[PDB]
Design a protein around this ligand. Structure first.
Ligand SMILES: OC[C@H]1O[C@H](O[C@H]2[C@H](O)[C@@H](O)[C@@H](O)O[C@@H]2CO)[C@H](O)[C@@H](O)[C@@H]1O
Ligand SMILES: OC[C@H]1O[C@H](O[C@H]2[C@H](O)[C@@H](O)[C@@H](O)O[C@@H]2CO)[C@H](O)[C@@H](O)[C@@H]1O
Ligand SMILES: OC[C@H]1O[C@H](O[C@H]2[C@H](O)[C@@H](O)[C@@H](O)O[C@@H]2CO)[C@H](O)[C@@H](O)[C@@H]1O
Ligand SMILES: OC[C@H]1O[C@H](O[C@H]2[C@H](O)[C@@H](O)[C@@H](O)O[C@@H]2CO)[C@H](O)[C@@H](O)[C@@H]1O
Ligand SMILES: OC[C@H]1O[C@@H](O)[C@H](O)[C@@H](O)[C@@H]1O
Ligand SMILES: [Ca+2]
Ligand SMILES: [Cl-]
Length: 496
């Protein structure tokens, strides 16, 4: 469960949040494969409640109605077409598996669902699965409300309703089997793995019992005996009885400490400085690198959901965001996930975004196509961070340097830092309020290298900055604190 099953030489996943299957299929072929992306995390592909108040929020996709592959991203034929086309160009698909719960217990009964299936939350009736009242934890939960009330009580966190979401009885073989049926359907289509939603809200052994029922990956694309990559969403910032390590038997685990701390460092909040990143990783109290799924922001915390956190960096803070993503992609710790977002009309009243619920760009609830502009950015209010040059080129940096040791660290005692990855790449950051002008040991072979932050290598030349590495491996770097992108990155495949 720990191997990502990406092609060799591809080292990151991109979350194409709320994208349609037909758009992802095209993206695989026209962009993700030639740019060396390892795979795509997709939004939940199973039927969910169509919530009309507020109007079609993103979070309706976390309220299942059935396991039919029928959503605003598309139908089963489109989903299958996408997985096939992506695998055929070497780009994997990872499914957001929403298996802890069905929908909210206060949702009205009817057919307000993305495939029109009938469901009745009050009576616990989900006949398109089917599930009945026997399949929920209503009798097992011990709180007075039936909901989770106290995170200091690990039992209620698992057995009670998260914010009223009907909690599936994952200790029952019937329920485990219906979930496995769904996940095996997806495996056989060709999915390479799963993001397991709300993993803290499930017992590790119930997750295990489900995974035990799963097939090996599709043997047309994956070697015999390949297992789905599993990465579990567990928010563990410390101080709770449930720990991310409790889930290591099932797969990797999201390291939410990563983006929380990195955001505070890059914002220069709380006395933090980039020079302290010299021991980034386990030295900062993070889980083992071979289990961490790392990221700057995710779909919840870029809008204050989940654990939130004011320090989280997002596309709204583009300059600092690019720096944080760049540091993450250059540093060997963890398996990296890049976010790809849509814009929404963020509006703060008191201190909260009252539009944090807004769903993807849409016309009367129909998700808009991802249109591609001539400069390779996206239209229709899709942000497409994964197409920003500075991020796309850092995805390739990570591939080029894969396996190479962290080395040649420099810092000025403040926020001017640099480091290399063996003899294959070097990166330099200036987050201080003055210019960084210095000759540094890069560890690289002598030559002229294109800076992949400011430009690209093409036709034996560079479209941005050029760095000149001498025979002794030293090169001069000058980065103004006024730079739009105050970091420079060079690697073996950007050498002229
Ligand atoms: O503007 C806040 C809130 O107003 C409406 O919510 C109402 C709902 O319509 C009523 O049927 C009842 O349930 O009380 C709700 C507010 O407590 C909107 O439906 C909702 O989207 C909006 O957030
Ligand atoms: O109706 C149940 C429940 O749904 C919404 O909760 C969202 C939550 O906002 C998201 O962060 C994510 O976890 O998915 C949840 C389920 O859709 C409402 O926000 C919540 O108040 C409501 O009780
Ligand atoms: O809301 C912050 C508070 O609750 C969190 O619960 C999360 C849930 O655990 C996650 O699976 C996420 O996807 O949505 C929920 C948000 O309600 C955190 O578990 C908790 O540590 C935090 O204090
Ligand atoms: O080491 C992890 C730790 O780094 C920073 O804390 C210390 C650092 O360990 C020391 O080398 C010292 O010189 O500076 C820092 C204290 O100012 C981070 O501040 C800390 O958050 C992090 O866990
Ligand atoms: O390990 C899985 C088990 O953990 C427990 O102790 C729960 O009470 C049970 O419902 C669950 O099946
Ligand atoms: Ca549960
Ligand atoms: Cl996540």
């Amino acid at each position: 469960q720990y191997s990502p099953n990406t092609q060799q030489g591809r080292t990151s996943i991109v979350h194409l949040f709320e994208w349609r299957w037909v758009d992802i299929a095209l993206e695989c072929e026209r962009y993700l494969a030639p740019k060396g992306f390892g795979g795509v995390q997709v939004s939940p592909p199973n039927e969910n409640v169509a919530i009309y108040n507020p109007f079609r929020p993103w979070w309706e996709r976390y309220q299942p109605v059935s396991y039919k592959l029928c959503t605003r991203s598309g139908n089963e034929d489109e989903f299958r077409n996408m997985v096939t086309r992506c695998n055929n160009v070497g780009v994997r698909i990872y499914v957001d598996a929403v298996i802890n719960h069905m929908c909210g217990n206060a949702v009205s009964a009817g057919t307000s669902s993305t495939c029109g299936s009938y469901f009745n939350p009050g009576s616990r009736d989900f006949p398109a699965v089917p599930y009945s009242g026997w399949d929920f934890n209503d009798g097992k939960c011990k709180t007075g409300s039936g909901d989770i009330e106290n995170y200091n009580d690990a039992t209620q966190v698992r057995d009670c309703r998260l914010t009223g979401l009907l909690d599936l009885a994952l200790e029952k073989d019937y329920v485990r089997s219906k979930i496995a049926e769904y996940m095996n359907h997806l495996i056989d289509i060709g999915v390479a793995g799963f993001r397991l939603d709300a993993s803290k809200h499930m017992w590790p052994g119930d997750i295990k019992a489900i995974l035990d029922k799963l097939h090996n990956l599709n043997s047309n694309w994956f070697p015999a005996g390949s297992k789905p990559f599993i990465y579990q969403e567990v928010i563990d910032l410390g101080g709770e009885p449930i720990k991310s390590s409790d889930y290591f038997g099932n797969g990797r685990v999201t390291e939410f400490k990563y983006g929380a701390k990195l955001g505070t460092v890059i914002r220069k909040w709380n006395g933090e400085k980039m020079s302290y990143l010299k021991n980034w990783g386990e030295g900062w109290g993070f889980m083992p690198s071979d289990r961490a799924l790392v990221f700057v922001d995710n779909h919840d915390n870029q809008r204050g959901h989940g654990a939130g956190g004011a320090s989280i960096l997002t596309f709204w803070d583009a300059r600092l965001y690019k720096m944080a993503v760049g540091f993450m992609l250059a540093h060997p710790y963890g398996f990296t996930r890049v976010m790809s977002s849509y814009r929404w009309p963020r509006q703060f009243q008191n201190g909260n975004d009252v539009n944090d619920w807004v769903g993807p760009p849409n016309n009367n609830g129909v998700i808009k196509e991802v249109t591609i502009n001539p400069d390779t950015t996206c239209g229709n209010d899709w942000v497409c961070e994964h197409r920003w040059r500075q991020i796309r080129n850092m995805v390739i940096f990570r591939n080029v340097v894969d396996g190479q040791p962290f080395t040649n660290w420099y810092d000025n005692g403040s926020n001017q830092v640099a480091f290399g990855r063996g003899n294959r790449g070097f990166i330099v950051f200036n987050n201080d309020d003055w210019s960084f002008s210095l000759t540094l040991q890069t560890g690289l072979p002598a030559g002229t290298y294109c800076d992949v932050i400011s430009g690209d290598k093409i036709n034996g030349n560079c479209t941005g900055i050029k760095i000149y590495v001498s025979d002794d491996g030293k090169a001069h770097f000058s980065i103004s604190n006024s730079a739009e992108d105050p970091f420079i990155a060079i690697h073996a495949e950007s050498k002229l």
